[PDB]
Design a protein around this ligand. Structure first.
Ligand code: A1AXI
Length: 212
């Protein structure tokens, strides 16, 4: 795999989103990976519905948090609508998938990266954007403005984001806190530190959808 990957440069990442007060990061992360794999497999970059996963993923908890793996499973089982069809409202309501017509895209499954393994995560990122989790509770991460982020942070993961690239000493992360956070909504997180957890626990739990 090459020294640099940046799925934004290949057109596989939609604009940075803002989840608002809702604890929906897990759905935003999952959607980033779906938009990416659909672009990679089909050539078309579309936006898909975070709101649909928020309402309909019965294994998650709406705005009280959730699981990127469960959302990617939901997309592999049923499907997902375009964002325009099922736009983000920032609050869990009722599942409306059956009232919004046929799904827009569908994947075929969910593979997990092997945790606590930098190269395994770099490998997946080399093939597609990947849903990852990290500790976002720290102030240093919350106030990040730019540069290669080294922490300080622990490995108490609490926040789902998406890895969309990497370089010799970082992994490139799309956050869902709006375009005003970090480097236009992205963070470059140091890698290669030899800590198995990764900076901010970045290697704890990383998933990607499979689409043939
Ligand atoms: C992420 C965010 O910052 O918005 C959000 O907190 C999240 O989903 N985190 C997530 C998680 O903790 N999920 C499961 C716990 C929620 C249990 C609630 C039970 C309430 C029952 N009514 C994981 C993936 C990122 C860390």
């Amino acid at each position: 795999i090459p020294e640099y990957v940046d799925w934004r440069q290949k057109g596989a990442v939609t604009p940075v989103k803002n989840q608002g007060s809702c604890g929906s990061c897990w759905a935003f992360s999952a959607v980033v990976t779906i938009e990416g794999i659909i672009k990679i497999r089909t050539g078309n970059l579309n936006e898909y519905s975070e709101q649909e996963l928020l309402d309909c993923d019965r294994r998650s908890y709406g705005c009280n948090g959730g699981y990127p793996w469960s959302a990617l499973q939901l997309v592999a089982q049923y499907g997902i609508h375009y964002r325009n069809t099922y736009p983000y409202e920032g609050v869990q309501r009722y599942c409306r998938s059956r009232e919004k017509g046929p799904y827009a895209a569908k994947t075929d499954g969910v593979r997990q990266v092997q945790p606590y393994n930098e190269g395994a995560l770099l490998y997946s990122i080399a093939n597609q954007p990947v849903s990852v989790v990290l500790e976002a509770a720290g102030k240093d991460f919350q106030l990040y403005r730019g540069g290669i982020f080294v922490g300080p942070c622990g490995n108490k993961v609490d926040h789902a984001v998406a890895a969309v690239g990497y370089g010799p000493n970082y992994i490139l992360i799309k956050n869902s806190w709006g375009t005003g956070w970090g480097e236009n909504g992205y963070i470059r997180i140091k890698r290669g530190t030899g800590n198995s957890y990764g900076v901010c626990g970045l290697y704890t739990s990383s998933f990607y959808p499979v689409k043939n």
